[PDB]
């Protein structure tokens, strides 16, 4: 997706609880650096629910696509308060931003 459009979405809907940079601080939610390829609930220093901790999934384009569409459906019991992003293209652009931002 479009990394540029993705940044705006993140800035507006995720930044209140998440940081994406290396060394990024944990807020209400965990820092997301190193997200791609990482299993659920593995950001060091953050205390996840057992639901997030044991989902047993690796974050990547396909998983994030499903998660971001409806978080609680994908991870029942999650303490992440977010209803989801319905438009497929918006999830794609956001996901493209995450791919970049969390690995640089």
């Amino acid at each position, epitope marked *: 997706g479009d990394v540029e459009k993705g940044k705006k979405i993140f800035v507006q809907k995720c930044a209140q609880c998440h940081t994406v940079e290396k060394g990024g601080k944990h807020k209400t939610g965990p820092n997301l650096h190193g997200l791609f390829g990482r299993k659920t609930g593995q950001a060091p220093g953050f205390t996840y629910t057992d639901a997030n901790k044991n989902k047993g999934i690796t974050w990547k384009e*396909e998983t994030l696509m499903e998660y971001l569409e409806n978080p609680k459906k994908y991870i029942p019991g999650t303490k992440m308060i977010f209803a989801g992003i319905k438009k497929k293209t918006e999830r794609e652009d956001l996901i493209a931003y995450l791919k970049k931002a969390t*690995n640089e």
Partner: antibody
Amino acid sequence: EVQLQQSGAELVKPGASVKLSCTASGFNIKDTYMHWVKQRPEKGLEWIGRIDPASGNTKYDPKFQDKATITADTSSNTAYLQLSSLTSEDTAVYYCAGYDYGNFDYWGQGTTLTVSS
Amino acid sequence: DIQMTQSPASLSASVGETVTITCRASGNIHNYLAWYQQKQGKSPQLLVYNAKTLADGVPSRFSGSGSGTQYSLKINSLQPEDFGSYYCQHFWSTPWTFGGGTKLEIKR
């Protein structure tokens, strides 16, 4: 103990098709992406594409879109590569591999395909 | 589609020497660059992923660095078992292309 066992060597006639398999064990193919890579004798690696068995979603290098078809039977822990309208240009070793963005990265032993009349 | 330009195609070196292989992507790949090693007649093996993280079982004489479109694989004090071929591959976007490869051979 992760293992990726590929099918045996194949000898097929030009114009025919062939299907190679890659059976995993020690892991589920749904946990990562299953790739197919071609390598002609003494030449470099060519990424044909991959499949995300969990979502059935496939990706290909355009150069192979009309030649190869990657599938996966998540109900047998096996991935497959189907090559159509074979020519001498398809004679090569084909590797399957399971991996995505991290340290989990395992390759099969490869399958040698010879296309000849 | 992003293409990887790997150089040199051939590299002559001696045991004990330090050597460097480079990969240039046709577009920014944001550190999603892996390096694979392929010993003569064997299957490729992951050596480095995410541009700088050594893979499991990989000796510390290996190291990778880079960012954007430029990346490098450095081998310090080459060992006899290091001679073979090396390939980079980006994971940024489909297709995940491999560089042309580098064949590390013995100088004489």
